[PDB]
Design a protein around this nucleic acid. Structure first.
Lengths: 244, 334, 165, 366, 177
DNA sequence: CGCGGACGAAGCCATACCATGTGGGCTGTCGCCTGGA
DNA sequence: TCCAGGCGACAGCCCACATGGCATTCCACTTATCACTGGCTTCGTCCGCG
């Protein structure tokens, strides 16, 4: 069981440890984010129990790391002296000091191939194919890849990440095989981070620590696509035999 | 139940929304730099235009006081003194279900028209729309209101070809000359960039109409939304670089399963020395063709174009104009 | 630009077999070096400088001596290969190539037939097809093709020369 | 309520506004280089012409202290009393310690940091408010660090004095957000409709008197020039302009004179040695009641030449205005004048007889 | 890869111009012009056999070969007196040693580095002939290979000349303690 | 007389010289007529 | 109906240049200008408003 989401598109930003103006993202997706996306695809309002999404497994193969960019983001500026974002007491600020400036970072031009393995994976897949809310990647303004769900049904999808999945073009030496690609499994762990989601309600966001271990694996060089227009093509023909 | 909208719009030499240091915001997609306009920009620019019309279509046309016909008139509460409130419901704009309260909690009391202060109960216009709160998320000057979202997913607009910023050396000249001329006002450098932006947005009427009701009011909100999405252009440095334009290609599609963007079609940047509108049009077509023949679905597609050279097959049936396309698509949406 | 090359190739083979086969149409196309062209090469033409580029070289084709009549490098290579192999003088064919590469459209058709026929009198292989697309290309951009001829000539001449030792 | 104006104007071999090194400013549009004239240059020529006729003199300057001191010296104040006076007028308008100033170079009055934008009668009235407190100003100069004594309310009301150029083009003043007026005219940069590369002119200023043995030039160098057919465009938001001016007759005169100056004027950049003065070969005014529109996308695909560019540019603007008109239908007004009678441009409206006639009938219809 | 051909040309042209006038006169008349201009139809005889196999590479070869044949007799008489630098370093060695105008050379260097493939060929010849007028030792092979790489991005050859110029200027000034 | 709106009061700040190598995809042709299969 | 042939007679050859030359000096400029506005915290009081 399981399916292979294809995390790609113009921009991605999985945030963490940022409860102020300055927002930051991780160099790889976080289960809280994509579990929020499945939850958004199944129609569970914030505050509902998320126990159903427990018992899931997410190994993610990073195709390209992508470069980090900072997004400057001012909110409430230029508006007249009687329209901004109120204060808790209700007394607005002076228009010269009214707007609030947040500089939210984001990860750009990267593509990940996650491998979901869970008991509810089939309904999750069928929910992503038709959701009850626009599914996004990190934040609402980021639009996901069209091929959000690369392969809908595969037994042992991890083996599919280790072999027979298209990769974007990169420098490959002559008649060289064994090109390394990093994938994260969850001793010899890399880091601990607040990912497991316990509650999404806006009144009390509650998360917990989760282990992460990045293993650099080797893949045969027969997956690297060509210079341009070849990668998207090869992945289309790859998603073509999904019916078969 | 997802109204997706794509549009190719070429903006001339200007600077729509600058960065933290003057440069225009840029993403690096498919390996190459690409100037972009933030989603917020093209949002506050559409919204600020929607209310300007929807919230004005119209105090002199449809009106809010023009009620009673279903709570104050065909109810018994002074069928002639109907102005009972009316005039008592004044001392933003709602739809109809939340208006039942407008003519509802507007009765009883006494009244005191014999010559009018209970508003903590009607004021909840936004708490339950204010359709401009179901289309787009909460307001920007009111505390949250049970419905923080949403619905109208809006995507960032990046160029379809690598564009590098270009430095515009400029200078200010003082008009009072001393005996040492050429002492201009202040030398400086302002960065600008031009290019053909790709834009995209989604409207989820499915989980939308609920929050409201009258499918006709919802229909009006989405139709004016699409017209504002094509019509509007941000208000950044326009008074110094007039960059008002219309999209050279408009593609509205109504999908009954899930919204889909065509951004990856523009992954491999386009090299030039020629124009970019025709190449972008036929390339978006090609991507729509392979994606359509790989993920087959019974959806509706329509598009308008300001160039009669090519024939875009995968984009549906070529309508004649933007408002005709919008009308036939909003109608075809239900 | 290849769309003219293929038509020119069909024309060169059909005209070659036609000149060795039928002497009537051979002598009739040779007289121009032009109604015969209107009735023979007209079906092989898709700017009139292209059409004249076709029938002109067709006549040059029909005017070649029998020795070279019974039998991809451009004309520059052809002249270099003629000079090194078949003893043509360097200081004379160089001067002739500059003389031809400097003129306008109406000049190349006046100074070209004599030189092409003369080099042909030694059984030199002229890829007539590209010669037709070259004289056709002479209208679109003259100095560009002339450049290709002169620099190509010297290039292959010194390349073959150093290659011979 | 938006008066849009389009114009095709071919400038000969010249250099209107150079870059920081001499070369003409260039855009990379539709993939190809294109010489351009910045918007601020034309806006400056326009204002100087409009205010030229309407002798309002909307002076933009830094040395307001120098001229206020000059006005006070004309009205009887001593040199030092005038200087300290003006410094009091400027120092009594900011939050505290007045607006920010710059390091005083000479013993001459210093120059403020921001650029002011006022008419001459405004400066005169400022000198009047300074004259109303002769004794007070003299008393403050006796100290070491004086402060504000002027009635900041009225001087702040004098800085808000508008003008035709202030009404159209707008003003900015950071230390006084109360005087900031927003412009009503969207002026666009003028880019060529065909890719043009720059070309170097080699010049040698030779000295007239000979030298004993040899003779060489006095100086040799090379300046960059370029020729081409520029496209230009501008919008006039009538609504906001009538809001700034207040009356409708003054507003109408301001927009009419704006359009006439927009077609007539040409910048003064290296014109003394190039004589690049010209008129637009095509003028298209349209009055739209929904939103302004530019025809820039029509000229994205650069035009190849060896032929002329005026006819191709004219008929191509026609084509784009026609199809664009049938794709965004609207009840707007369209009119155009043309300096070439070969083709007939239908989609541009009703062909008026001349530029001033076109402007009169279009401003009237608005 | 190209530098090797560059050293070949510079070799035989560096001895050619001094050893026989026919090629020096056939090449001199090709400075700053297109490889197909009829006036240069006499230079192919010498340069055409060395180009390898884009037009930027041939433009580089012909243009700099012409530059080498159009230098004054003083610069050739010193050119024939008997890691490695670009021409930027040559500009700095020219201003620091031979007294050129610093504030001018800086704006002429940024003026040329800021242009397109055709602007470097029109502005370049007089600049390099001025440098050889002051007999600064300029390296030709690097100059051509640079012009050859000048056509793929107008950033990877300009930035290194500008930064190399300033670098060597402040090293020549710091070394003058 | 009753009071709106706007500002200001600080806590803060920070003696044993050198570098960068890259690219690839689009297009249609004739000789015509009689004879024999 | 389609594939294949045909359609008066229309020349052959031989030859194609040697040499010599391709310029020098000189000149490369100056000065003036380079902005602000802010996104901290609560409360009490103060000047202006009704």
């Amino acid at each position: 069981s399981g399916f292979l989401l294809r995390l790609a598109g113009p921009m991605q930003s999985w945030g963490e440890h940022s409860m102020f103006g300055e927002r930051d993202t991780l160099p790889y997706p976080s289960r809280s984010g994509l579990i929020g996306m499945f939850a958004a695809a199944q129609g569970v309002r914030r505050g509902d129990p998320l126990d159903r999404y427990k018992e899931l497994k997410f190994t993610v193969r990073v195709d390209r790391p992508g470069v980090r960019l900072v997004d400057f983001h001012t909110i409430g500026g230029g508006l007249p002296k009687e329209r901004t974002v109120p204060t808790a007491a209700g007394e607005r600020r002076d228009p010269k000091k009214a707007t609030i400036v947040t500089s939210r970072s984001y990860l750009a031009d990267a593509v990940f191939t996650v491998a979901v393995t869970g008991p509810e994976a089939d309904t999750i897949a069928d929910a992503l194919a038709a959701p009850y809310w626009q599914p996004y990647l990190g934040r609402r303004a980021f639009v996901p890849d069209p091929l959000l769900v690369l392969r809908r049904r595969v037994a042992d999808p991890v083996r599919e990440l280790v072999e027979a999945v298209p990769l974007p073009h990169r420098r490959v030496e002559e008649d060289a095989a064994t090109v390394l690609v990093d994938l994260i499994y969850e001793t010899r762990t890399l880091t601990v981070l607040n990912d497991v989601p316990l509650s999404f309600d806006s009144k009390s966001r509650r998360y917990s620590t989760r282990q992460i271990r990045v293993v650099p694996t080797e893949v045969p060089a027969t997956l690297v696509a060509g210079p341009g227009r070849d990668y998207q093509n090869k992945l289309f023909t790859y998603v073509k035999q999904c019916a078969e | 139940t997802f109204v997706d909208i794509h549009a190719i719009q070429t903006l001339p030499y200007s600077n729509i929304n600058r960065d933290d240091l003057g440069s225009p915001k840029t993403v690096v997609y498919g390996g190459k730099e690409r100037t972009r306009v933030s989603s917020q920009s093209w949002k506050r620019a559409v919204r600020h235009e929607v209310e300007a019309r929807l919230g004005d279509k119209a105090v002199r046309t449809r009106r809010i006081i023009s009620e009673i016909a279903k709570r104050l008139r065909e109810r018994g509460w002074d069928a002639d003194l109907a102005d009972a409130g009316a005039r008592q419901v004044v001392l933003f704009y709602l739809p109809v279900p939340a208006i039942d309260e407008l003519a509802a909690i507007a009765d009883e009391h006494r009244d005191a028209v014999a010559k009018i202060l209970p508003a903590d109960r009607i004021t909840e216009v936004l708490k339950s729309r204010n359709v401009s709160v179901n289309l787009f998320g909460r307001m920007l000057a009111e505390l949250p209101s049970t419905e923080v979202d949403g619905a109208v997913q809006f995507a960032h607009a990046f160029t379809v070809h690598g564009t590098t910023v270009e430095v515009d050396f400029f200078t200010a000249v003082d008009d009072i000359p001393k005996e040492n001329d050429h002492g201009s006002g202040h030398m400086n450098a302002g960065q600008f960039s031009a290019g053909t932006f790709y834009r995209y947005a989604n409207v989820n009427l499915d989980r939308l109409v609920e929050n409201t009701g009258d499918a006709q009011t919802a229909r009006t909100a989405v139709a004016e939304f699409l017209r504002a999405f094509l019509s509007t252009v941000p208000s950044g440095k326009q008074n110094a670089t007039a960059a008002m334009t219309l999209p050279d290609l408009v593609h509205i599609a109504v999908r009954f399963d899930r919204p889909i963007s065509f951004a990856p079609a523009f992954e491999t940047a386009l090299y030039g020395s020629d124009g970019y509108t025709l190449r972008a049009c036929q390339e978006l077509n090609n991507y729509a063709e392979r994606l359509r023949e790989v993920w087959p679905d019974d959806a509706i597609r329509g598009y308008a174009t300001v160039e009669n050279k090519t024939d875009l097959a995968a984009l549906g049936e070529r309508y004649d104009s933007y408002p005709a396309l919008i009308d036939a698509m909003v109608a075809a949406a239900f | 630009s290849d769309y003219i090359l293929q038509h020119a190739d069909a024309l060169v083979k059909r005209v070659s077999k036609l000149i060795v086969n039928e002497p009537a149409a051979r002598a009739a196309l040779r007289r121009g070096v032009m109604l015969a062209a209107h009735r023979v090469v007209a079906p092989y033409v898709p700017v009139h400088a292209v059409e004249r580029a076709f029938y002109a070289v067709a006549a040059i084709m029909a005017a070649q001596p029998r020795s070279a009549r019974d039998q991809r490098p451009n004309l520059g290579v052809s002249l270099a290969q003629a000079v090194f192999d078949k003893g043509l003088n360097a200081d004379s064919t160089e001067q002739r190539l500059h003389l031809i590469a400097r003129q306008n459209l109406d000049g190349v058709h006046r100074h070209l037939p004599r030189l092409v026929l003369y080099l042909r009198s030694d059984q030199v292989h002229i890829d007539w097809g590209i010669l037709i697309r070259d004289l056709a290309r002479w209208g679109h951009t003259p100095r560009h093709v002339a450049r290709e001829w002169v620099q190509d000539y010297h290039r292959t001449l010194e390349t073959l020369t150093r290659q011979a030792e």
